[PDB]
Amino acid sequence: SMSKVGINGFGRIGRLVLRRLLEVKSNIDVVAINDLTSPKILAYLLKHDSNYGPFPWSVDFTEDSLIVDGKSIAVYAEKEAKNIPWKAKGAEIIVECTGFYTSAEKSQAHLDAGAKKVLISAPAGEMKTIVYNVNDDTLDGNDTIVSVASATTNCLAPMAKALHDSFGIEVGTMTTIHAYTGTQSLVDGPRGKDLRASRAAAENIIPHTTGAAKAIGLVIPELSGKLKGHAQRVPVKTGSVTELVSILGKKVTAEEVNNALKQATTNNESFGYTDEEIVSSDIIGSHFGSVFDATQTEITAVGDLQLVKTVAWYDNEYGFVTQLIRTLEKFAKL
Amino acid sequence: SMSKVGINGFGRIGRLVLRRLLEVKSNIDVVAINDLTSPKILAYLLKHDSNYGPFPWSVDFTEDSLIVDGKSIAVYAEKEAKNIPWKAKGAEIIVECTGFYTSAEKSQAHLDAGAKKVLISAPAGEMKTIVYNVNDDTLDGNDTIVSVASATTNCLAPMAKALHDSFGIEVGTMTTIHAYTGTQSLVDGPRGKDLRASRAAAENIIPHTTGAAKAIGLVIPELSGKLKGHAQRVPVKTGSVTELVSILGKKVTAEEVNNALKQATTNNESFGYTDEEIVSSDIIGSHFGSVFDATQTEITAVGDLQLVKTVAWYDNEYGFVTQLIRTLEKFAKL
Amino acid sequence: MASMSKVGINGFGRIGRLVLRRLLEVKSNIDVVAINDLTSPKILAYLLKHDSNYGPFPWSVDFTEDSLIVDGKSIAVYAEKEAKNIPWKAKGAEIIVECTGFYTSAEKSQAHLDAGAKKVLISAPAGEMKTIVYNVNDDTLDGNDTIVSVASATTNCLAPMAKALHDSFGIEVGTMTTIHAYTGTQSLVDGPRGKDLRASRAAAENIIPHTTGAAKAIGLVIPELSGKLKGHAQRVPVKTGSVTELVSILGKKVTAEEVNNALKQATTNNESFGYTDEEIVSSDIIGSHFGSVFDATQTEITAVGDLQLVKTVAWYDNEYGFVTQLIRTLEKFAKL
Amino acid sequence: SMSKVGINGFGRIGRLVLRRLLEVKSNIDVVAINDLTSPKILAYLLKHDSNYGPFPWSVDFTEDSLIVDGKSIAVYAEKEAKNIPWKAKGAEIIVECTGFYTSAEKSQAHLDAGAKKVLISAPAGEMKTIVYNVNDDTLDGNDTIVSVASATTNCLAPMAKALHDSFGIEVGTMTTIHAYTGTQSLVDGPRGKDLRASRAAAENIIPHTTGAAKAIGLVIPELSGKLKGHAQRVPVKTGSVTELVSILGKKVTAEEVNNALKQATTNNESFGYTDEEIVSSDIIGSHFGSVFDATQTEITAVGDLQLVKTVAWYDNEYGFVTQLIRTLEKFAKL
Ligand SMILES: NC(=O)c1ccc[n+]([C@@H]2O[C@H](COP(=O)([O-])OP(=O)(O)OC[C@H]3O[C@@H](n4cnc5c(N)ncnc54)[C@H](O)[C@@H]3O)[C@@H](O)[C@H]2O)c1
Ligand SMILES: NC(=O)c1ccc[n+]([C@@H]2O[C@H](COP(=O)([O-])OP(=O)(O)OC[C@H]3O[C@@H](n4cnc5c(N)ncnc54)[C@H](O)[C@@H]3O)[C@@H](O)[C@H]2O)c1
């Protein structure tokens, strides 16, 4: 099975990819990293993390490498993926975490550069898109470029799946109250064409567009076109929550909904359950993609008109990274 | 007619009440303030405000009074309202902003203590409850204890009223993404029996119960029992947003919902409109109770089914206070 | 073989909860048998399990109507606002870790001895009493001590830096400023907070000057420096992790390398006082197992003629870092 | 008298420059703005400010300009200053606020492009560097490129000047506890070569080099080489404080220090005084470059040895901008 990985974009996601691989003692070896900076800066960022603390393994660097837990990782600095010399250390699967290659057309450049497969850490149009433990059985040996969608997708999908499977989702809308991320702004100023994204992220509630509900059909085909939603980006550094308001195909109670969700999270490494009164910092470092929270379930009904609100936590950094790695490990073995 | 007011609880809401009364050059006369502390400390807090900056008028104090814009205000420190000596300076209407007297039974104390009327800055059970420019016409000459509900109620109600009047609301659910408040905790520690309220407010997304939707029937009786909702408390110091997901009585477009709401905000001092891409800091200092945001309107439709998401902003401190003062001015004259 | 001292914690707050965490983490021979606070087992269990700064508790937590069950061991829970009413004898708690902020003097903490405990270790400055910064002056403890202080997190950060400088070069005079994470003494929203006007102001929205005795009372820890230091704090919006700057006139003209080498030697094989030459920031100190970490990167010598100002800087996790010092002192104090 | 100005870099400082010019009714006209974006996004940014709230004047835009208070201001988007069409509108003095032209040789490009003078809103090496009400008497009719140093310089300088004039400073070191700015990072990631600048600014105390003290000699020639210092960047959006530890030329008391400072601030529009127990949010919107705070003065004396700690607040955005404008007004008339 494929064992050698390259990371393009050693950022919030990319660094945590490495951390998680070492944490679970994967047989996958990161042999090369591509970014835009020096091994020194990358080593500093890897060692020191504002959200997860000190790196649990040794970190050193040379003029062209990192040395992590005694093992050498090549560092390249090629801004165009086609130029990355992936063949030098035999990088087979590229974990694409820059945000700049979010299409099949763009990410195939890695193949041109000598890789064999690409797993994109973000939605990437209508390509094969996987939420582990929702539709990873759609992966096969001919899949060369795959997406794991967004963290919000990885949160929304398992909850939507469980509801759809148990009760039917006829139509629904999502709002995720989401930690700020690097696409936003530190101080008020231009941030491409999105006006809201220009505003100081740690000082505002900021409405934000997300494709998680719009594109749910890639992951749950029967919900294709049945969901919409958006985000409110807020001042927490990581840790996020997704609310879904649904018309279901059945009259339900809160307990019935909660029991169905509990069943779907039983023996499920991707999808956790809680009935404790947690808050967002309690999900930081979660090993799930999504944690359904039974305490926030709400059924609002007048006669036969019924709205169902269901809420799941997610650590948009590490929790999501756990999903990307489970997908990666399976990808490497097809 | 009644012109002399006392404020119980010179807190975030209590101090802004005075600021607003001065700002609009009210004929109402604040003659007394009760709290738990010295004039010195109350004077310091009035003068220097972390959210709204320097107090626009002069402030001084003596051992038992504040002197605000040259006028003397008596200061009392009675922790039981029934002991507050309101007859001394002839306080007739009490603006009750402590959070400790949120029922008719409890606020009866101010009347026993020699006041004539009480206006509670919070929900207070099944009593007359006023959102100005939604149901202020229900205020009556024999009312002696009334509520202005919560800021969230002042945000939700005019949006709900508009939608219901134009389209009918059949059922609906609310989530407010809401600035943290003094009911929460600075560091993790006991905060009565609300476990979530025990958690560090500026470092977490914190689900929180609110009655704004549940008790909406006090303000819009046709909507009794048709709404539920809750809050997510987040790390902004003031400025909040309310989302409502509704099943309406008619099929609609976004443009149609937005035009109805625009008409409802026309010449409406309590309820504003924007189609700008604002964020929470842009609402701080608002003179509305609610500002409907056309940019966030969302219609999700599958077949005969439709969900409608509408969103309004609110300064849960100053905005809400502008509503409290409109209600007080009218209350004072009946 | 092992000294098995029975401990009670008064005030199961930020510090009190981390005291239990840390004792379990190091597999201490101390048994915590009782906790007193102002609330229910249910609420203490919630707070112990979920921590905004340090994440999930590493052991199981449950509660009954009158106890916590932590990793399978029962800890009695009391809620007596007056320490004299705490039934410390019921489970044989002998050494009280006093972490409420309300008994910070010999006369006040006497209440624990009257209620049947034998010794009190106060998690804060407590006036003129034996005041210990571990690995600075813990040799001054003896069998006769019954009530002792570990001073502030700021003292635990200042003292080892000041000791090293004094021993190597002599400090003639100095002033400190700590840029310090906000704590529970401050305010969430603007509102009354005792008599400290500045403490009334929203802690997560302001730089707030704040008085601290860390420098003023340094003589309790390093007698040779009594009266030679002053300082204060600026409280700022980070949830934990703080930094202490000291500006000093030394007894000897120095270079930055010379100051850094001296401080390096002082941190060698020193479980309480760490060193760094990496470009760390406050979140890097969160969860530190040192009372203080000297930062060679911020050393600064300013010199004109024969006049020299030396600025030296140390990080500290004012929560967990300080707690590790508290525990080291607790373990010693319990054996005496 | 020159009165056409162009702003290069319409950022936090650039937009506040225009706000302050309008506020003081300057006879200077901003006729052009260069940035990297559209009029629509600049207009949005001008209108809505996370630190200072809504713009006090009307703001609109066309395809090629802003309309501010009914007056037209051209907008350009030239990355290289030598391409900026300053002559089109006859922009005479360029207020240089991008941070990319902080040297005589770099800001020369504006003069090559047709402007007559340049005021750089930052330290710009060994050039004339003005703190208004400290050394603005050094400006003359022959000057073409000048600096107003940093906000920290505008804070430090007036306090250093009062101390030195009254007592002599023999040596000193500064620490500014300073609001985070746009040179820092929102999430941990590369920010050129400065390792500490890579770290999430709203979640850390971050040491930071600054030359405010190092280069004080350009402003107070007698202190040249007598001061060092640095910054701790912390999570407040604006509003900063500067501490100075000095060895003075005589023995002093705290009362004596504070009276000397009170005196230096009397009828001084650039330099204020306080003995109120203020916090950083209270300095936001200050019309001073610096506000000396008598409550934080501390004298540490051991026989002949004495350390004097003096402290001054500054709004590093708006307050500094008031100083920049004062200097601009004078620069325009020589
Ligand atoms: N942060 C989150 O919550 C989150 C969650 C799920 C998915 N994602 C997705 O993961 C991707 C990365 O997100 P992030 O938060 O880690 O962003 P980030 O900005 O932290 O990291 C991006 C990294 O890529 C580097 N980079 C940029 N352009 C490059 C290029 N052309 N070549 C090589 N390197 C380049 C940057 O230097 C940086 O290290 C994005 O697609 C994002 O949508 C983010
Ligand atoms: N902050 C908001 O967003 C908001 C908005 C709408 C309504 N409200 C409501 O207004 C009320 C006050 O809220 P706040 O945010 O101003 O609270 P706050 O904590 O800022 O103020 C409460 C004030 O009352 C004083 N106080 C407490 N108990 C007292 C007593 N027994 N007698 C006299 N004084 C006492 C306190 O010292 C404080 O000054 C509450 O009912 C709250 O729900 C708050």
Ligand SMILES: NC(=O)c1ccc[n+]([C@@H]2O[C@H](COP(=O)([O-])OP(=O)(O)OC[C@H]3O[C@@H](n4cnc5c(N)ncnc54)[C@H](O)[C@@H]3O)[C@@H](O)[C@H]2O)c1
């Ligand atoms: N950075 C820090 O937080 C820090 C560092 C070093 C020392 N300290 C000191 O440790 C002590 C506690 O600090 P903290 O941050 O944990 O405070 P905290 O408020 O989080 O905890 C105090 C705890 O004491 C309980 N309590 C209050 N009064 C009580 C009483 N009369 N009886 C029983 N329980 C009572 C509270 O309910 C709370 O659980 C203080 O003396 C403080 O100065 C704090």
Ligand SMILES: NC(=O)c1ccc[n+]([C@@H]2O[C@H](COP(=O)([O-])OP(=O)(O)OC[C@H]3O[C@@H](n4cnc5c(N)ncnc54)[C@H](O)[C@@H]3O)[C@@H](O)[C@H]2O)c1
């Ligand atoms: N923010 C403060 O506290 C502060 C205080 C004093 C001085 N300054 C200085 O003032 C200057 C501006 O700082 P700021 O905080 O406003 O930064 P900012 O990042 O908010 O603004 C920079 C602006 O310049 C634009 N820009 C960048 N490169 C450009 C180019 N090549 N051509 C045209 N426009 C370009 C950006 O789009 C942006 O609008 C800097 O030199 C800074 O050191 C800042």
